[PDB]
Every structure is written in structure tokens, then in C-alpha cells.
Amino acid sequence: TLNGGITDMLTELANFEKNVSQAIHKYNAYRKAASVIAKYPHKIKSGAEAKKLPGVGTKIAEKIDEFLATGKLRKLEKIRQDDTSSSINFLTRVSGIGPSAARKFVDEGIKTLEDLRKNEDKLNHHQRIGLKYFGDFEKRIPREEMLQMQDIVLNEVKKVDSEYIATVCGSFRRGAESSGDMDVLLTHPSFTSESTKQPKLLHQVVEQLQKVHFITDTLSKGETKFMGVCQLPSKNDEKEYPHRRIDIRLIPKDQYYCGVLYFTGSDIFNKNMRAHALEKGFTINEYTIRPLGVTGVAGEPLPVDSEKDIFDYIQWKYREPKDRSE
DNA sequence: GTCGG
DNA sequence: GCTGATGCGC
DNA sequence: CCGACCGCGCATCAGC
Ligand SMILES: Nc1nc2c(ncn2[C@H]2C[C@H](O)[C@@H](COP(=O)(O)OP(=O)(O)OP(=O)(O)O)O2)c(=O)[nH]1
Ligand SMILES: [Ca+2]
Ligand SMILES: [Ca+2]
């Protein structure tokens, strides 16, 4: 991290814009700049050097110059002092509490961990579980635990039906030595883009993982997406493992390559890749890549036989998962 | 906040 | 109930 | 200058 100081600064600014200003495009602008700088292989010496990078403009160059000279940003020092901004930024750290909800809470006088803990009845289900595991959810997961988690999930899914394929994606598939949480892509031959020849495909798998006490809470659950909480088994006399967030996504078997591209990320990589797709006259989602027509209407799904084919369509050289960590 | 048409 | 918008999250 | 900014699942709420 040659430029940690700068990218931390921009990340803080992005978070401010999302959580407090509720300015989602300013948030993405800061994130995009943060990401381009993070992969820049030189220690940056000026805002002018930075402004050469795409996504870094005048305003960010000016901030980078201030940060380099002093080591601080006045705009940020002030944000850190504002109690309302600080409270909103804190509350949004709870899963299920976003910028709108946080601001509502701050109005009602709820703005600390203690406040939340005595007002659970003011929280929806998701929020209540986010509060319950507030501390655990901020811890990262060593790849070594991610591997044990993978073994449990893969083996339990095999027991429900040997035809399931479960692939762990997210940062784990990108080779990270630690992950924020577990993301599992699931497929079954009974569920394709053409037919759903079997109901409860996701349910049954969630049920089995609850049965062995791996999954411990549900945040949300539909026919194709589960978001919840899980925990590794611990040994005799040892402290329990932290509770972890787990997402499970059931994707049509014939659309696996688009799905695994999506779920492997990173998020910024996906946003960048999809944006580029639009520039090349395609739209990409987790299911398909489709041509855009003159009218601007998504056409029919193009044939895809590998992750690489998606890269081919938009004239990108293939990038292995480990190089998609933007 | 940045950028391409 | 459904539909569409909005909030939140991936 | 200025329109456009990735794309979508689930939970919630208003309006009908
Ligand atoms: N298109 C798109 N895909 C996203 C977005 N956010 C997340 N994804 C996809 C790509 C991510 O790698 C994948 C899993 O999301 P996560 O929040 O778990 O992130 P990731 O595993 O990369 O990082 P982590 O180590 O868990 O903090 O979901 C998004 O905003 N847009
Ligand atoms: Ca993850
Ligand atoms: Ca996740």
C-alpha cells in the first residue's frame, strides 16, 4: 500500500457522502478514485500526478495536495467533529441500518451502542441481528477458517443432493488471506433459465445447514438469495468462533459463468466491467451478457461457455480472479 | 465528483 | 392482495 | 457544458 494515506482519506470521504449526504454518485466517485490510486504502482508525489489517473479530477487532486503537505484534510477533520455526522456514520455500521434509518434514529435520540441495546423493539429483524452480532461482524475471517467453512458447506450440500454444486466466491475466490464474509454460489440441474423443475432448492440447503447448527440466524431469505449468519464448531474448553455473515445465491445452472463472474467481484471490478460493457454496447448482469440495440434496448442473451467469453465480448484480456481485487 | 460526447 | 417505489445489501 | 453514472434480490410501505 504505497498510497494508504490517500486511499484511506478518499474512502472516508466516500463513506461520508453515502451515509451522511446520501449522495450515492459522489460515494462512487470517491471509491473509483480510491481504487485507481490503490493499484497505481508508484508512491504519489502530487495531486497533478494523481489527476493523470481516470476518476481523479480537480477536486480530488486538490485534496491530495492538501493531504500530502499536511497529512490531514480539513474537510475530514471537521466531519470528524460534527456529532450528527459521527453518529450517523456509527449507526450505519450496524447491518440493516442504512443512511436513512441512521438519520431517523439520530432524530429520535438513538445514537450510541447503549441506545440501540435498550431499544431493540424499535429495530426490524435484520437490524436486530446486526446489533446482536455487531462486534463479531467487524472481525475479518482468516483464510484458514474460510477453508473449514467451505468444507462444511460443500459437504452438507452434498448430503442434501449430490447434484448440487456449491462454489465459494467473493474475496475468497480472489485468493484473499482474509475475507469480510462468506459468499456461496449454488447451482442444481433442476433450476435453469428454462425451467424450475424443483421447488425449495435453496430452502432445503439452508435447512440442512441450520440442522447441523452451522447457520444460526437469517437476515433475509427468498427463492434465490439467502443472507444470514453462521458459525464454525469449536472444540472442548475453547472460546467460540465469532459469528460470521454468509450469503448464498442460487443461480440457474446454465448461467453459472455470468453468476460466478458477478459473485467473484470485487464490487468495484464489477461496476467498472459493467460500465465498460455499456461503452462497448453490451449490458452484463449475473445472468447474461446482452447486446444493446439502437433504441438502447437490451437484446437477447449471447452464448457464454466460460468466464473468459464474457471478457472476450467486451474486448478485455482475461483477468484471473486474483487480479480482480479492485 | 468525474468524465465523454 | 398486488404493484411500484424506496431502503439496504450483494 | 451536462447527461450519465452497474445491476439486481429481499424487506418494507404507500396507494389502490
Ligand atoms: N455488480 C455488483 N456486484 C457487487 C456489488 N457488491 C458486491 N458485488 C458482488 C461482487 C463481490 O465480490 C460479491 C460479494 O460481495 P462482498 O460484499 O461479500 O465482497 P467481497 O467478498 O469481494 O469482500 P469481503 O472480503 O467480503 O469484504 O458480490 C455491487 O455493488 N455491484
Ligand atoms: Ca465476501
Ligand atoms: Ca457477502
Same domain, yes or no: A158 and A116: no
* Domain finish residue from A239, A262, A285: A262
d(CA A147, CA A271): 28
d(CA A57, CA A53): 8
Distance, Å, A16 CA → C6 C1': 21
Q: Which nucleotides of chain B are near protein (any atom < 7 Å from a CB)?
A: 1-4
Testing ligand 1's pocket by substitution, the residue of A27, A150, A270, A278 carrying the most ligand atoms inside 8 A of its CB is A270
Which residue's CA is the closest to the ligand 1 atom numbered 27?
Answer: A180
- Cα atoms in the 13 Å half-sphere on the side-chain side of A242: 18
Atom of ligand 1 lying closest to residue A271 CA: 1
Give me A121's grid cell.
423493539
Torsion of CA A152, A156, A158, A164, to 10 degrees: -90
| DSSP result, A206-226 | HHHHHHTT-EEEEEEE-SSEE
d(CA A118, CA A121): 8
Distance (angstroms) between ligand 2 centre and the Cα of A25 equals 23
Same domain, yes or no: A254 and A272: no
Alpha helix segments (H runs only) across chain A: 4-19, 24-39, 47-51, 58-70, 74-81, 83-91, 99-107, 113-117, 125-132, 134-138, 143-160, 170-173, 201-211, 256-264, 267-279, 307-313
Give me A308's grid cell.
473468459
Cβ atoms of A247 and A225 within 8 Å: the answer is yes
Same domain, yes or no: A241 and A131: no
**What residues make up the domain containing A9?**
4-82
Same domain, yes or no: A220 and A162: yes
Q: Which nucleotides of chain C are near protein (any atom < 7 Å from a CB)?
A: 6-10
- CA distances in angstroms from A101 to A3, A79, A220, listed in the order given: 34, 20, 18
How many other CB atoms are there within 10 angstroms of residue A68's CB atom? Answer: 16
d(CA A29, CA A232): 38
Place of cell 467486451: A314
Determine whether the distance from the CB of A22 to the nearest atom of strand B is below 7 Å: no
Q: What is the CATH number of the domain that holds A183?
A: 3.30.460.10
Same domain, yes or no: A158 and A183: yes
| DSSP result, A103-164 | HHHHHTT--SHHHHHT-GGGS-HHHHHHHHTHHHHHS-EEHHHHHHHHHHHHHHHHHH-TT-
What is the identity of the amino acid at A154?
L
Query: Per CA to C1' distance, which residue is closest to D7?
Result: A285
Same domain, yes or no: A148 and A245: yes
Q: What is the stated resolution of the deposited model, in angstroms?
A: 2.0
Same domain, yes or no: A180 and A234: yes
Q: Which of residues 29-88 of A touch strand B (CB under 7 A)?
A: 29-30, 33, 53-61
Q: What is the CATH number of the domain that holds A98?
A: 1.10.150.20
- CA distances in angstroms from A191 to A115, A153, A269, A310, listed in the order given: 45, 20, 28, 22
Distance, Å, A118 CA → D7 C1': 37
- Cα atoms in the 13 Å half-sphere on the side-chain side of A111: 13
Q: Is A318 left (phi over 0), alpha (psi -120 to 50) or beta?
A: beta
d(CA A47, CA A57): 9
Ligand 1 pocket residue status of A187, Cβ below 6 Å = no
Ligand 1 pocket residue status of A171, Cβ below 6 Å = yes
* Domain finish residue from A63, A82, A101: A82
Catalytic annotation on A63?
Answer: yes
d(CA A102, CA A108): 10
Cβ atoms of A136 and A103 within 8 Å: the answer is no
d(CA A50, CA A62): 10
Place of cell 500500500: A1
Q: H or E element: which one contains A183?
A: strand A182-187
Distance (angstroms) between ligand 3 centre and the Cα of A245 equals 7
Give me A37's grid cell.
490510486
Q: What is the CATH number of the domain that holds A276?
A: 3.30.210.10
Same domain, yes or no: A65 and A118: no
Same domain, yes or no: A228 and A252: yes
